Design a protein around this ligand. Structure first.
Ligand SMILES: CCCCCCCCCCCCCCCCCC(=O)OC[C@H](COP(=O)([O-])OCC(O)COP(=O)([O-])OC[C@@H](COC(=O)CCCCCCCCCCCCCCCCC)OC(=O)CCCCCCCCCCCCCCCCC)OC(=O)CCCCCCCCCCCCCCCCC
Ligand SMILES: CCCCCCCCCCCCCCCCCC(=O)OC[C@H](COP(=O)([O-])OCC(O)COP(=O)([O-])OC[C@@H](COC(=O)CCCCCCCCCCCCCCCCC)OC(=O)CCCCCCCCCCCCCCCCC)OC(=O)CCCCCCCCCCCCCCCCC
Ligand SMILES: CCCCCCCCCCCCCCCCCC(=O)OC[C@H](COP(=O)([O-])OCC(O)COP(=O)([O-])OC[C@@H](COC(=O)CCCCCCCCCCCCCCCCC)OC(=O)CCCCCCCCCCCCCCCCC)OC(=O)CCCCCCCCCCCCCCCCC
Ligand SMILES: CCCCCCCCCCCCCCCCC[C@@H](O)O[C@H](CO[C@H](O)CCCCCCCCCCCCCCC)COP(=O)(O)OCC[N+](C)(C)C
Ligand SMILES: CCCCCCCCCCCCCCCCC[C@@H](O)O[C@H](CO[C@H](O)CCCCCCCCCCCCCCC)COP(=O)(O)OCC[N+](C)(C)C
Ligand SMILES: CCCCCCCC/C=C\CCCCCCCC(=O)O[C@H](COC(=O)CCCCCCC/C=C/CCCCCCCC)COP(=O)(O)OCCN
Lengths: 140, 121, 98, 83, 129, 347, 105, 99, 171
């Protein structure tokens, strides 16, 4: 729900890193839990224990991604003293991509993931700054 | 512009009576000529699918294709013109009835408008 | 909205979830649709009787009839599937795939 | 005529139940449209008061509306009594 | 209060739905649905819907749960929302249900056509070949 | 079956759709849906085989679940306001129940899983009917209550449908599954403009129906249900393959073909509402549909595949039965872009 | 979409069954009939947007009559406070509410 | 209250009698030593079900006769009965009532 | 929103008609014939005001008139009435047909004593008019003022300016 969205967004971007990391970790974990539920539904692998293991691995991976993104992005914003900069978000995305690569132990996916995640993060920051609407209300 | 609920709209009329106050499209209208061309293309494709001499297999059938396409296109053009006329009429009436939402801009000449200049170097 | 309405709504939700589970035995799926329609009938009847809306006293019966007709068709389908396999198991219907 | 008579005689034998059922259903469809007592049934249904007859506020221009049930003006049920 | 008889009836309804929603041994699920239908009929009757409750209990139970069992065997807060006045010398439910012929001509037509089509559809589906 | 019974069932399906379209009472709309479902099953099972029975039972399960959800939405809406007229819902929960029921009836993601399997199981004429006529009633209901829908949910399902159709079509060799995934993507395109303009929804529906009718009639004419079977058509009916290639190009949204009209217009409409990112993603995803259309065109008409010797005998015979409206469908699906402003007719 | 055949032909196929206050058999009156009549007369011809924003009072009253949620809240508050007072012992119900009254016809 | 108590009494008496019948001879010791699925029975069950649905609609006929619209009610009742007869006739002529 | 005003307990105190439903059914026809005017006043006021709090004095009047009717019955023919009601009370459905003879005796007694003629079939169900001086309620529903309708513009249609104006199309 939007409760986690508000919990993340309410914290100022350039301050108070640990709560930002906590919120991003929770959001990532919720996303991973939804992904695990869908994966269990569509592909029941063999049994209960392997299924709960797969849920654990997906949730921990997504939570680690969110934690690293939030921590790195907030630390970059704090040290650079320049809030409202998409570069900080891009760095966070790159950090998140690196963490994902480590989990999958692939140099290519880690590199590929880092570049793509960073770009996505930069775009989200630009949308926050400029007021871009993903889901626009009917205006006209 | 959703006009489904527009007041005084008879449910299933293709053309209302007030549409008769608009000029009908000319028979040499380019859109009507395109409709006839589409009918001719349909006739040629029908000949080709049936393995008949494409250009000169059925002249009655090709004539019927062209005529039906032109007929429907004429009525469709009438309805389209009527709907666009209604859109313009409603727009103008709304602007007229709400002057405070469409205030007049003060006419200003370029002599006293300061535009920033950007050199190309 | 008092507690009886929420009880009937959660009964409908339980029936819908049970239908969406598909352990086996497509007959159980038909039974779950059937419990769904029964809950719908009960709650619609309660709403219509409580508000004294005299004319919609028709629509529960109609609903029943239509749903019952649906049930018949489903049974036929079930039967025909069994005629191909000897059982109404859900997992036998995997000839068609995404 | 002759073929219809032959068909009816052939069906009345070996299929009397169907002949009787079709005749009874056809009569049930046709006869109500010709009976003169159907309007009597409609009038009897109209004369059954299920609700309280709400009085009308007198305004000095209602001659056909009674002031009391015993008054001559108003609908009567003598046709019902004679039935 | 009789400890909320309507509430306990609704609770038994939910419990029966939970009972047959696990889908154990489809005869047992069918019996759980029969119990749930009886309890729902009791709810409707206690509410005041005598005709509709009896329609449930007759049509639903005695016909279509019966056909489901036949096919399966072939194979392997209350009291508050209520009214104050009376109805007159008739039952409003019966008059409203009764009104379908006078008022609901369209409903009768579509329902009858649907049922005839359903008969045709069943025979065609079960034709085989 | 008997032609009389087949005609009766077809008219019953059309009468159900019509009942849904002309009624103002929620009960009558539900009854029309029930009538349509009841008369649709034998059409899917017209040719008897186990696959058709499986397709029909899957379709029945899906549609009956959707009907029960729709009746639940109707009853909840009645509970929170004693109204039976189809208009704005007035209840947040009821609208969601209604939206999911109509998405399940239409085949929108994530309720798309039944469409490819049902389309593959049934014959080509049944698939034509299922993919053309069976979208009118749910879309009409959606248009009637478009002011109620939550834009977030509808747009999420639309984007999901476009993505799923594009990705799922890439993996198919069967023509019916390709048509099913194409229909899923086109439904996704149609439902993304409901919150803003129902006229664009209807225009997209009409264009899609025209193209789908043309493509199915071409597939029936050259009786092929696989890629390799269609690869033999040039050796008997090259003109059919040429028409099919042009129709496939149109279905991919290339200008100046007719298939470019909807997306363009839809994109244009979505830009008037300050929605920029979503149309961009929709077009980028439609590139996938274009890719597998182009692969089909490569395999069918742009290259000449090997044939067999028995094909010579087929050279001596001609079709006994013909579709009268096939040329008109082809022309209307390829060459109507100059007549775009006629969309003011509120089609 | 919606083809209003009934309005064009004047048929009334299903409009008799859409609202509470529309000619019930034997003139039976709906429980919320007065509230629905006011809401309908407020919102006639005005359009859906203006009806939703301007006829909110009548719709709120109609909804309240239909579900009686606020009446339930008030009655529950009264009963709960009475229970608290009787548990504390500083309130005593009168003979009317104990069944000891004198009934009237 | 009266009907519930009557139902409870009937069920209680039946249960008491059945259990005493099932346990009276249990006190003294004694020796104490497929596929076919015919299609016609499903069809008769479905016909009964379809007919049963038709039966519900009429159920209100006793009350339907006091409406002041006797013509419309009579027409619709006869229409329903005629469609029931047509269902029976269609199933008859298509060998749906045979063994 | 506001306080619901209710009459005091003293306003609702009235000399009550304390006879059972069998007695009332036995007397009903003559009661409707005799006590008609206050009853119609009350019922017209009741359907016009749509408010119990606005009709209390008419209810007191109908109670008084019913009491007067029963006092007349008591004074002239108590025994004939008692026998007739005994019969009505016995039957569970309280049918008039079961005790016709008792009714006949009662009818003869009242006519001689009070000149009362029993109303015939179809008379008490008539819709009658009431001469009342109570004003007609101008706003019985307590409705608000209806919102202003939409402008309802009118004019004479002209062709769309420069055509459809859609992208590159000149018509
Ligand atoms: C259009 C304009 C013009 C464009 C021009 C073209 C531009 C594009 C072309 C050039 C692209 C260069 C980078 C491409 C990706 C390289 C990585 C890759 O593809 O992985 C596949 C591949 C997948 O893993 P794998 O094939 O399973 O592993 C087998 C390896 O042999 C196992 O390797 P190993 O274990 O021997 O390696 C040990 C060590 C490598 O360290 C070293 O030996 C050198 C240390 C200095 O690992 C690392 O250092 C990882 C850090 O990884 C590799 O094999 C190479 C890993 C080393 C990559 C080093 C970094 C490369 C340069 C990265 C910087 C440039 C892009 C950064 C963008 C970040 C922000 C956007
Ligand atoms: C920009 C707008 C302006 C331009 C408009 C462009 C479109 C206009 C026409 C639209 C459709 C109408 C015709 C289609 C029916 C098909 C006919 C056909 O098959 O051709 C054979 C036929 C001759 O052969 P035949 O001896 O009669 O019979 C042998 C078989 O028919 C055929 O022998 P076969 O079947 O044994 O040979 C096999 C062959 C046969 O298969 C085919 O050729 C089928 C034709 C393609 C289907 C077209 C699809 C629908 C049209 C949409 C076009 C989209 C345009 C948008 C731009 C994208 C470009 C793709 O198939 C193949 O070889 C397959 C491999 C080919 C490569 C892949 C195919 C590429 C397709 C792209 C074609 C697009 C342009 C087509 C131009 C018209 C073609 C005749 O051609 C014609 O004679 C018809 C041409 C038009 C007649 C014009 C008459 C007017 C002249 C006098 C009046 C003067 C007017 C001015 C007034 C002022 C004077 C004073
Ligand atoms: C393909 C073409 C096949 C033949 C069709 C013949 C007419 C073609 C018209 C096409 C445009 C229709 C239209 O909307 O016109 C309004 C408008 C032109 O009307 P206008 O500017 O008032 O007319 C100027 C004439 O000089 C004023 O002309 P007028 O009023 O004197 O008209 C006399 C009539 C003369 O009639 C005849 O000659 C009959 C015999 C031929 O016109 C003609 O037939 C000759 C042209 O066209 C446009 O706004 C631009 C349209 C741009 C193309 C459409 C958008 C998509 C472009 C690519 C489409 C690809 C399609 C698939 C491949
Ligand atoms: C891809 C080509 C598709 C062509 C479509 C099929 C062509 C054959 C159709 C045969 C004639 C159709 C006319 C129907 C006669 C009466 C029409 C009347 O009943 O309907 C009116 C309206 O009729 C239709 O709207 C007009 C249909 C015209 C469609 C053409 C526009 C397509 C876009 C341009 C593409 C180029 C096509 C032209 C080349 C043939 C009033 O509708 P209304 O009850 O008030 O509201 C319902 C619609 N709402 C809900 C959206 C508001
Ligand atoms: C006009 C267009 C004709 C062609 C299109 C036909 C479309 C399909 C056919 C079915 C539609 C028939 C329309 C009937 C709608 C019913 C409403 C209308 O007819 O008035 C009714 C009249 O009912 C009459 O009985 C009409 C009888 C027609 C039904 C009998 C046969 C119908 C068969 C149609 C198809 C069914 C299946 C196929 C059978 C072969 C109501 O009568 P009334 O009581 O004054 O008013 C009630 C309101 N009150 C209570 C205030 C007084
Ligand atoms: C307008 C009124 C309509 C409503 C009334 C009908 C209500 C109920 C009656 C209809 C029920 C369904 C009937 C289905 C018809 C099927 C008959 C059939 O197929 O049976 C044939 C045989 O039956 C027939 O011959 C067909 C019908 C024969 C005619 C029956 C009566 C037709 C009308 C007669 C009277 C018409 C009006 C009155 C005229 C008489 C003068 C007043 C074969 O019999 P089997 O058992 O299968 O095998 C036997 C061979 N081994």
């Amino acid at each position: 729900a939007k409760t986690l969205l508000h919990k993340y967004s309410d914290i100022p971007e350039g301050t108070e890193c640990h709560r930002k990391a906590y919120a991003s970790t929770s959001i990532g974990g919720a996303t991973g839990l939804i992904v695990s539920a869908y994966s269990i539904a569509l592909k029941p692998p063999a049994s209960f224990l392997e299924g709960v293991a797969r849920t654990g691995r997906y949730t921990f991976t997504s939570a680690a991604i969110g934690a690293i993104f939030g921590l790195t992005s907030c630390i970059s914003a704090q040290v650079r003293e320049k809030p409202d900069d998409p570069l900080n978000y891009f760095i966070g995305g790159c950090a998140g991509g690196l963490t994902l690569g480590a989990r999958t132990r692939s140099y290519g996916i880690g590199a590929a993931a880092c570049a793509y995640m960073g770009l996505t993060a930069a775009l989200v920051k630009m949308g926050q700054l400029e007021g871009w609407q993903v889901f626009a209300e009917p205006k006209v | 512009t959703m006009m489904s609920g527009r007041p005084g709209r008879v449910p299933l009329q293709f053309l209302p009576n007030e549409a008769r106050s608009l000029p009908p499209p000319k028979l040499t209208d380019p859109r009507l000529v395109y409709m006839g061309f589409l009918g001719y293309c349909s006739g040629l494709i029908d000949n080709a699918i049936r393995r008949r001499p494409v250009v000169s297999a059925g002249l009655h059938r090709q004539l019927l294709y062209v005529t039906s396409f032109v007929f429907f296109g004429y009525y469709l053009l009438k309805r389209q013109d009527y709907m666009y006329a209604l859109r313009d009429h409603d727009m103008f009436a709304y602007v007229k009835s709400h002057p405070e939402d469409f205030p007049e801009k003060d006419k200003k000449t370029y002599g006293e408008i300061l535009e920033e200049f950007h050199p190309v170097r | 909205m008092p507690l009886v309405y929420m009880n009937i709504i959660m009964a409908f939700a339980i029936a819908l979830a049970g239908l969406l589970m598909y352990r086996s035995h497509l007959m159980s799926s038909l039974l779950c649709l059937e419990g769904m329609m029964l809950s719908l009938f009960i709650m619609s009847t309660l709403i219509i009787l409580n508000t004294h809306f005299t004319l919609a006293n028709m629509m529960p019966i109609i609903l029943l009839v239509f749903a019952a007709c649906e049930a018949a068709l489903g049974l036929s389908l079930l039967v025909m599937v069994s005629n191909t396999y000897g059982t109404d198991y859900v997992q036998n219907l995997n000839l068609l795939q995404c | 005529a002759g073929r219809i008579a032959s068909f009816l005689k052939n069906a009345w034998a070996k299929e009397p139940v169907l002949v009787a059922s079709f005749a009874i259903g056809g009569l049930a469809i046709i006869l109500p449209s010709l009976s003169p007592y159907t309007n009597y049934a409609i009038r009897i249904n109209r004369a059954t008061p299920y609700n309280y007859p709400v009085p009308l506020r007198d305004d000095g221009n209602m001659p056909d509306v009674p002031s009391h049930p015993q008054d001559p003006q108003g609908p009567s049920l003598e046709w019902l009594k004679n039935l | 209060m009789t400890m909320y008889i309507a509430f306990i009836l609704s609770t038994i309804f939910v419990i029966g739905f939970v009972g047959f929603s696990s889908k154990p041994s489809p005869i047992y699920g069918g019996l759980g649905l029969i119990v749930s239908g009886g309890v729902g009929c009791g709810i409707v009757l206690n509410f005041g819907g005598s005709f509709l409750g009896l329609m449930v209990f007759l049509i639903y139970l005695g016909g279509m749960l019966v056909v489901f069992g036949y096919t399966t065997a072939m194979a392997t807060g209350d009291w508050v929302i209520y009214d104050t006045g009376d109805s007159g010398f008739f039952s409003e439910e019966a008059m409203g249900i009764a009104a379908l012929y006078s008022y609901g001509t369209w409903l009768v037509i579509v329902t009858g056509w649907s049922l005839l089509i359903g008969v045709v559809v069943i025979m065609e589906i079960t034709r085989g070949n | 079956m008997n032609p009389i019974i087949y005609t009766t069932l077809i008219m019953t399906v059309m009468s159900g759709t019509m009942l849904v379209m002309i009624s103002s009472h929620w009960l009558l709309i539900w009854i029309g849906f029930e009538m349509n479902l009841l008369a649709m099953i034998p059409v899917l099972m017209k040719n008897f085989n186990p696959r058709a029975t499986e397709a029909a039972t899957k379709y029945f399960l899906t549609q009956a679940t959707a009907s029960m959800m729709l009746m639940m939405a109707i009853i909840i809406n009645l509970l929170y306001s004693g109204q039976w007229t189809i208009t704005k819902m007035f209840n947040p929960v009821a609208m969601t129940m209604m939206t999911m029921a109509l998405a399940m009836k239409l085949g929108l993601s994530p309720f798309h899983f039944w469409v490819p399997e049902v389309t593959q199981g049934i014959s080509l004429q049944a698939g034509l009917l299922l993919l053309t006529w069976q979208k009118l009633a749910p879309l009409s209901v959606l248009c009637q209550i478009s002011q109620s829908i939550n834009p977030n949910l509808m747009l999420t399902m639309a984007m999901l449908s476009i993505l799923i159709g594009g990705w799922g079509g890439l993996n198919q060799t069967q023509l019916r599954k390709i048509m099913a995934y194409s229909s899923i993507a086109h439904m996704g395109w149609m439902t993304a403009v409901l919150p803003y303009n129902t006229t664009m929804t209807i225009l997209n529906l009409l264009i899609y129906i025209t193209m789908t009718l043309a493509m199915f009639m071409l597939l029936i004419h050259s009786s092929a249900t696989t890629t390799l079977s269609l690869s033999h058509t040039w050796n008997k009916m090259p003109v059919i393959t040429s028409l099919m290639m042009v129709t496939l190009l149109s279905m991919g949204g290339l200008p100046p073909l007719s298939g470019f009209m909807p997306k363009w217009m839809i994109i244009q409409e979505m830009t008037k509402n300050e929605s920029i990112i979503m149309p961009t993603l929709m077009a980028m995803t439609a590139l996938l549909n274009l890719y597998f259309y182009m692969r089909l065109a490569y395999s069918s008409s742009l290259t000449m595949f090997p044939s067999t010797n028995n094909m010579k005998m087929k050279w001596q015979f001609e079709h006994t039965k013909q579709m009268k409206l096939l040329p008109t469908m082809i022309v209307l699906s390829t060459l109507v872009l100059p007549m775009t402003p006629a969309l003011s007719s509120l089609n | 979409p919606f083809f209003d055949v009934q309005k064009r032909l004047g048929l009334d196929l299903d409009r008799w069954m859409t609202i509470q206050s529309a000619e019930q058999p034997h003139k039976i009156p709906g429980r919320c009939h007065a509230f629905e009549k006011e809401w309908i007369e407020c919102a006639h011809g005005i359009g859906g947007i203006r009806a939703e924003k301007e006829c909110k009072i009548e719709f709120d009253d109609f909804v309240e009559c239909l579900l009686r949620q606020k009446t339930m809240k008030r009655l529950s508050a009264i009963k709960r406070q009475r229970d608290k007072l009787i548990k504390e012992g500083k309130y005593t119900p009168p003979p009317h509410h104990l069944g000891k009254e004198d009934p009237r016809p | 209250m009266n009907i519930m108590l009557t139902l409870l009494t009937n069920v209680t008496l039946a249960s008491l009698l059945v259990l005493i019948a099932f346990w009276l001879p249990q006190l003294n010791a004694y020796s104490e030593k497929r596929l076919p699925f015919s299609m016609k029975f499903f069809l008769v069950a479905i016909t009964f079900l379809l007919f049963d649905l038709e039966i519900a609609l009429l159920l209100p006929l006793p009350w339907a006769s006091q409406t002041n619209n006797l013509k419309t009610m009579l027409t619709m009742a006869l229409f329903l009965l005629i469609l029931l007869a047509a269902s029976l006739a269609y199933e008859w002529t298509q060998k749906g009532l045979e063994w | 929103p506001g306080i619901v005003e209710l009459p005091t307990l003293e306003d609702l105190k009235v000399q009550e008609v304390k006879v059972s439903s069998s007695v009332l059914k036995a007397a009903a026809h003559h009661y409707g014939a005799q006590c008609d005017k206050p009853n119609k006043e009350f019922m017209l006021c009741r359907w016009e005001e749509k408010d119990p709090r606005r009709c209390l004095e008419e209810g007191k009047l109908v109670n008084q008139c019913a009491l007067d009717f029963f006092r007349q019955i008591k004074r002239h023919c108590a025994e004939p009435f008692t026998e007739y009601w005994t019969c009505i009370d016995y039957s569970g459905l309280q049918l008039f047909r079961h005790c016709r003879k008792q009714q006949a005796k009662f009818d003869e007694c009242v006519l001689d004593k009070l000149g009362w003629v029993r109303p015939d079939l179809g008379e008490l169900s008539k819709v009658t008019k009431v001469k009342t001086d109570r004003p007609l309620p101008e706003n019985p529903y307590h409705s608000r003022a209806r919102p202003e309708p939409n402008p309802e513009a009118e004019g004479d249609l002209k062709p769309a300016k420069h055509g459809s104006r859609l992208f590159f199309w000149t018509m």
